[PDB]
């Protein structure tokens, strides 16, 4: 589960570009984002067998790949963490503090 | 000094040394306060472009009044609590 979320401010980074700023997210938002990544990787995998355990076992296998560190969701976690570190300075950007104070 | 001569340049005045009761993190804070009190950053922003005399005179009048109005406002705010304390 990631520890931060990227919120964007419309038209404050330059020529129509947005100002992305990281922010923390509570537990329920961390678990929700994590488990939804897992289901995204599961739905894209191909079918394996038959019966009533297809979807269940296909999800459980991804849960094991996560604990073993060989899953694909680890890349999405590190990808969003990079955006946070690459934008940790925007928390005090001149645009975010000069909205209507330059009459 | 007698052997080596002191380097007398504008940076010589903006220098802060590390000592026993002042570490590197302490000298940085002292350097920032003095650099702010001397308005070094403001000069770099005003010297970036040219402001003809009339525009500079009118910009000062606007900034000098906002400074008096703000200073006279803080006196009324605190004068209000001197009277409230007395019970008026």
């Amino acid at each position: 589960a990631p520890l931060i979320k990227m919120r964007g401010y419309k038209g404050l980074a330059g020529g129509g570009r947005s100002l992305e700023v990281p922010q923390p997210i509570p537990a329920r938002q961390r678990r929700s984002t994590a488990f939804k990544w897992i289901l995204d990787v599961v739905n894209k995998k191909p079918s394996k067998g038959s019966g009533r355990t297809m979807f269940a076992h296909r999800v459980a296998e991804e849960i094991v790949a996560v604990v073993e560190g060989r899953s694909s969701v680890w890349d999405k976690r590190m990808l969003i963490h990079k955006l946070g570190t690459a934008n940790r300075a925007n928390l005090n950007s001149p645009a975010l503090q000069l909205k209507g104070k330059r009459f | 000094q007698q052997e080596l001569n002191i380097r007398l340049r504008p940076s010589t005045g903006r220098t802060f040394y590390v000592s026993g009761h002042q570490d590197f993190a302490g000298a940085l804070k002292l350097l920032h306060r003095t650099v702010a009190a001397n308005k070094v950053k403001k000069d770099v922003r005003l010297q970036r472009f040219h402001e003809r005399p009339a525009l500079k005179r009118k910009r000062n009048l606007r900034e000098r009044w906002r400074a008096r109005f703000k200073e006279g406002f803080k006196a009324a705010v605190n004068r209000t609590f001197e009277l409230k304390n007395q019970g008026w």
Binding site: - | Q1, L4, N5, I6, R7, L8, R9, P10, S11, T12, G13, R14, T15, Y17, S19, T34, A37, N38, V40
Partner: protein
């Protein structure tokens, strides 16, 4: 015995919070010991009076005093505002013109204090040097 050293640390800590210098004859009330009085709301060490009138000297006639010039400029060589000096407009102009004369005449630096004054101030062995480079 180390337990005695930490006591000296805790002691001096409180001594820093007592932002007041008691003197003989100073009257005090139970209120003069509360935080509101020890906090020292005054954020300015204002000067009593115009020292130029109290010391009775003509600035222009004392331009050659290097210590007097360095006293009325910031470490960056900038003349001090009347807020810091606490002078009347007439005496502020005389001390400002006294600094500009010394700097204009070329006997006092313009971006720092006089070199001979830097040799004495703290950081003597650390002053920036000029390596001959050749």
């Amino acid at each position: 015995v180390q337990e005695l050293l930490q006591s000296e640390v805790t002691s001096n800590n409180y001594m820093r919070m007592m932002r007041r210098r008691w003197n003989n004859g100073d009257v005090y009330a139970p209120r003069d010991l509360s935080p509101y009085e020890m906090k020292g709301r005054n954020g300015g060490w204002v000067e009593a009076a115009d020292v130029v009138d109290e010391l009775g000297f003509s600035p222009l006639d004392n331009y050659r005093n290097f210590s007097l010039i360095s006293d009325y400029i910031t470490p960056f060589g900038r003349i001090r505002h009347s807020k810091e000096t606490g002078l009347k407009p007439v005496n502020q102009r005389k001390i400002a013109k006294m600094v500009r004369r010394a700097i204009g005449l070329g006997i006092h630096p313009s971006v720092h204090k006089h070199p001979e004054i830097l040799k004495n101030s703290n950081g003597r062995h650390l002053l920036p040097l000029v390596v001959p480079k050749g």
